[PDB]
């Protein structure tokens, strides 16, 4: 399903007071957090729905007509209109604009607000993979005053937990600190509770909430529910995944000049010689070799592309040592057993994984993705299950399908004669590399092209005056490298390059 | 082609190099010709993209921003496009050879890198670096940019 997240924000003057006016009020900074969340969701999940409500405010807005409870936006895909609506209250005097058009001061029932957000959840006609609600305050004293309403509120919250709603609470700015557990000590749905101090901290996890992460993060689904055939009949359902996948820009949309309507496009194939109109059955494909213009149908081409049925044809076992690094064709894929169609597939898969790990060999297999495709030989490397220090499976157990190139996949290169160098120069390079050595992490970079693309997208979506500029991590720290090295490069250059070498020419 | 370039380490190093496609995807350079089934003529065939009806001068390109649609002219995108530099191939850093896994091998081709054609000192520097990296179990992180319109790349 999707994710249901509702940002629940008080309006009872508990967000307008500030420790100092140089620091953001508990209100406006929450607005910035929510807007950042909207942006991140736009980047990540279009199909999710998010809502924002206000309670304790003087007026109200909700179908249940529960007073002092005003929904600002309902469970919907994020929209720039919503974000700018928040922005009009974001920052200084944005809370003043709020007071002017919205106001606050009244009390509420947390039972009542829980009822309202439960109504919001019942409203959506779409399946939610998660039931998240986000509460913004620094204070639990309103219902910390009366025990009856507090008991009713906690009973309602337990009920909503029974419904599967996961309540989460944030530490908000307060001069007297959050001072937790005045009401909220066990009224929080938590999978791992570790907060019991007064927590004068003005934040709990607001840093990443404000952090603009740029990723799509599509939900997991197998790239192919293929069948692994050992010989012809020992077949198991197997799941194939692109454990990594080069992301690309969203395609452009054809819009009108004045109304920006998505333009319905149609490319008819027609006889220009007679001005008539053609049909798919009315044309024939051709390729001319030498004096012969060979004419075919496209279909005939498709069936001459038919070699093997979709599946896996095990071709044998080759030791992992027999693999050349430069023999790479296209990014590898992950292999996982599936019991959906073949039961016992996972037991056999585990047996094979352990055995290939022992004997240190790869199962070379003839692979056909789907019909009308020439099967390819691919090496399946037994991929272990790797768990981090947190025992989180960082590398799943399975197999690594690497594509084995064919004879033509290479290209003849105008090689050059082999030339050696002095071992002193080798030591110079070793020392220089040691100077410029750096620890590698998988997520160490982003595509600056796509980054600035999203930056521009956000700017126009927010109709900004000027876009934020994406930083290019891929740009080297030339000054830092010169600082690290010194004249080692000059020494090696004199060791190698005579004092007439043209750097480029 | 010959792709002459410079391996750039900091600013103090610049070595003329020749890196070509070693392993790559294959496909014929001659594609089909959809001709008529009756006169076997392609010139009689014709496609006609039609926008509704309007011409190509009534249309712009747009982009779906979440729930919202954004007008975005191609001139504006080119102006705001992050533009890198062409034929610049600099080194980004040095990380352990064990740190990297072939599971993250991107692209569809394998590029073998030589030094400049007939540059003895370039070959000497290349061999010295090769031996150093080999003895150190060492792999080099580099930024690849083919031309001005090329996207910058991070590769091993």
């Amino acid at each position: 399903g999707r994710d249901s997240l509702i940002f629940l924000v008080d309006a009872s003057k508990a967000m307008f007071e500030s420790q100092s006016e140089d620091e953001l009020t508990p209100f406006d900074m929450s607005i910035q957090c929510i807007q950042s969340v909207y942006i991140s969701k736009i980047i990540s999940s279009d199909r999710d729905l998010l809502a924002v409500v206000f309670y304790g405010t003087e007026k109200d807005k909700n179908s249940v007509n529960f007073k002092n409870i005003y929904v600002l936006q309902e469970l919907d895909n994020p929209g720039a209109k919503r974000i700018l609506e928040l922005d009009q209250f974001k920052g200084q005097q944005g809370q003043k604009r709020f007071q002017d058009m919205m106001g606050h001061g009244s009390d509420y029932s947390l039972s009542e607000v829980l009822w309202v957000c439960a109504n919001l959840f019942s409203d959506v006609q779409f399946k939610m993979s998660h039931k998240r609600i986000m509460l913004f305050t620094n204070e639990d004293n309103p219902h910390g005053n009366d025990s009856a309403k507090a008991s009713r509120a906690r009973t309602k919250a337990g009920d909503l937990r029974d419904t599967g709603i996961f309540l989460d609470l944030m530490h908000l700015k307060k001069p007297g600190g959050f001072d937790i557990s005045l009401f909220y000590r066990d009224i929080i749905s938590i999978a791992e509770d570790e907060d019991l101090r007064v927590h004068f901290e003005e934040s709990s996890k607001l840093e990443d909430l404000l952090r603009k992460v740029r990723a799509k993060e599509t939900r997991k689904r197998a790239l192919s529910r293929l069948k692994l055939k050992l010989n012809k009949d020992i077949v198991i359902s197997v799941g194939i995944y692109n454990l990594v996948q080069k992301a690309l820009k969203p395609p452009p949309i054809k819009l009108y000049r004045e109304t920006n309507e998505p333009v319905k496009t149609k490319t008819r194939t027609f006889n220009t010689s007679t001005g008539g109109l053609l049909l798919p059955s009315d044309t024939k494909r051709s390729q001319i070799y030498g004096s012969r213009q060979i004419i075919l149908e496209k279909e005939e081409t498709e069936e001459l592309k038919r070699f093997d049925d979709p599946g896996l044809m095990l071709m044998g076992f080759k030791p992992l040592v027999l693999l050349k690094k430069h023999h790479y064709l296209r990014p590898s894929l992950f292999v996982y057993p599936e019991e959906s169609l073949v039961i016992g597939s996972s037991t056999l898969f585990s047996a094979l994984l352990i055995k290939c790990l022992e004997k240190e060999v790869a199962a070379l297999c003839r692979y056909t993705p789907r019909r009308n495709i020439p099967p390819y030989f691919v090496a399946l490397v037994p991929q272990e299950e790797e768990l981090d220090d947190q025992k989180i499976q960082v590398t799943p157990p399975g197999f690594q399908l690497v594509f084995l190139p064919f004879a033509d996949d290479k290209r003849k290169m105008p090689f050059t004669e082999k030339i050696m160098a002095t071992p002193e120069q080798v030591g110079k390079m070793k020392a220089i590399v040691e100077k410029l050595r750096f620890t590698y992490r998988s997520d160490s970079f982003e595509n600056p092209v796509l980054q600035q693309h999203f930056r521009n997208l956000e700017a126009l979506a927010l109709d900004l005056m000027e876009p934020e500029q994406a930083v290019d991590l891929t740009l080297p720290k030339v000054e830092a490298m010169n600082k690290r090295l010194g004249s080692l490069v000059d020494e090696f250059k004199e060791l190698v390059y005579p004092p007439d070498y043209n750097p480029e020419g | 082609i010959h792709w002459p370039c410079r391996l750039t380490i900091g600013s103090n190093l610049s070595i003329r190099i020749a890196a070509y496609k070693s392993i790559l995807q294959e496909r014929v350079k001659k594609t089909w010709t959809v001709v008529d089934a009756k006169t076997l003529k392609k010139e009689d065939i014709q496609k006609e993209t039609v926008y509704c009806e309007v011409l190509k001068e009534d249309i712009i390109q747009g982009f779906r921003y979440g729930s919202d649609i954004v007008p975005f002219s191609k001139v504006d995108e080119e102006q705001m496009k992050y533009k890198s530099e062409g034929k610049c191939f600099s080194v980004l850093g040095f990380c352990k050879s064990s740190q990297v896994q072939r599971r993250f091998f991107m692209g569809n081709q394998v590029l073998k890198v030589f030094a400049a054609r007939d540059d003895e000192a370039a070959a000497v520097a290349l061999s010295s670096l090769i031996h150093a990296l080999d003895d150190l179990d060492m792999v080099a992180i580099v930024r690849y940019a083919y031309d001005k319109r090329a996207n910058p790349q991070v590769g091993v």
Binding site: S45, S129, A191, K205, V213, E217, R437, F438 | -
Partner: peptide, 23 residues
């Protein structure tokens, strides 16, 4: 939940991008 992006439930925590860090 530990080791999970609270922004994207069912998705692991997203580290800051970071860059080259010489050793």
């Amino acid at each position: 939940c530990p080791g999970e992006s609270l922004i994207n439930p069912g998705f692991k925590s997203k580290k800051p991008a970071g860059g080259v860090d010489f050793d």
